[PDB]
Amino acid sequence: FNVRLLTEIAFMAALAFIISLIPNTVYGWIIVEIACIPILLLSLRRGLTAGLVGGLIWGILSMITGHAYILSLSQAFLEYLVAPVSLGIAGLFRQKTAPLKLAPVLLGTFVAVLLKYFFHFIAGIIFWSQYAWKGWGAVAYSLAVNGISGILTAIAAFVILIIFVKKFPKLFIHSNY
Ligand SMILES: CCCCCCCCCO[C@@H]1O[C@H](CO)[C@@H](O)[C@H](O)[C@H]1O
Ligand SMILES: CCCCCCCCCO[C@@H]1O[C@H](CO)[C@@H](O)[C@H](O)[C@H]1O
Ligand SMILES: CCCCCCCCCO[C@@H]1O[C@H](CO)[C@@H](O)[C@H](O)[C@H]1O
Ligand SMILES: Cc1ncc(Cc2csc(C=O)c2C)c(N)n1
Numbered sequence: 001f002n003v004r005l006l007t008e009i010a011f012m013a014a015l016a017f018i019i020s021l022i023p024n025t026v027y028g029w030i031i032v033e034i035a036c037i038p039i040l041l042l043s044l045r046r047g048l049t050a051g052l053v054g055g056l057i058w059g060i061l062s063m064i065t066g067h068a069y070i071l072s073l074s075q076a077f078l079e080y081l082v083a084p085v086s087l088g089i090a091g092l093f094r095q096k097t098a099p100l101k102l103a104p105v106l107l108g109t110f111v112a113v114l115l116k117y118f119f120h121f122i123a124g125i126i127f128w129s130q131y132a133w134k135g136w137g138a139v140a141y142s143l144a145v146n147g148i149s150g151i152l153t154a155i156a157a158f159v160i161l162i163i164f165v166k167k168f169p170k171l172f173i174h175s176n177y
Helices: 002-019 036-046 048-064 071-093 102-127 136-168
Strands: 026-029
Touching: 002 048, 026 036, 026 048, 036 048, 036 102, 048 071, 048 102, 071 102, 071 136
Parallel strands: none
Antiparallel strands: none
16 A cells, blocks of 8 residues: 555654664764664665655755755755665665565665765765865775765664564565555
């Protein structure tokens, strides 16, 4: 049903935003983005389009609540529309049939967090270089900050989605009935 789908999309976007309110800073803009997780789960369970749309709504929530860090129109577009929308790419690893296998869950999480932090890394180069550490070029700087955020976000998403695969595998498989 379309009703069920819209609500799940809506709820997971809201959940992501709500989770984004937890302090998640390790050092500067090195962060653990646990708020990616409801979007990943949404995409993994409902597929690409649902995932893309959940990401969109999450990004729009960040911006209109003042919880987004904005430097320009293009940068906000890149980092709060494209980047969260890109998480939906996880939907390409949706499993429709039991038994749930772990490897597609990890593979789709890895690819989507990577795709997300790839866009932040491009952002870092164009929009954030003024903050590059003493002696660091912009590309190197952005790689470390966003390469490390990506890895820690993926670590976090794995821990949680692994627990879910083992204790609640059906979260990942949509049933009409
Ligand atoms: C697709 C829906 C997304 C639109 C939501 C954008 C949220 C508004 C944030 O913009 C803000 O505008 C203010 C006025 O110029 C500036 O004071 C501030 O610096 C800038 O951050
Ligand atoms: C595609 C996402 C929609 C984004 C809408 C919010 C745009 C917020 C604009 O912020 C402002 O941008 C100016 C240049 O763009 C800067 O000069 C200014 O310092 C900065 O505060
Ligand atoms: C997924 C990535 C996570 C690890 C972060 C890697 C840090 C990037 C370092 O880059 C290199 O540092 C050299 C230091 O000598 C510079 O000279 C060189 O120009 C630059 O390219
Ligand atoms: C060096 C660097 N610093 C800050 C950001 C901005 C950023 C990093 S993760 C994330 C998720 O909301 C945002 C807005 C960046 N891209 N690169």
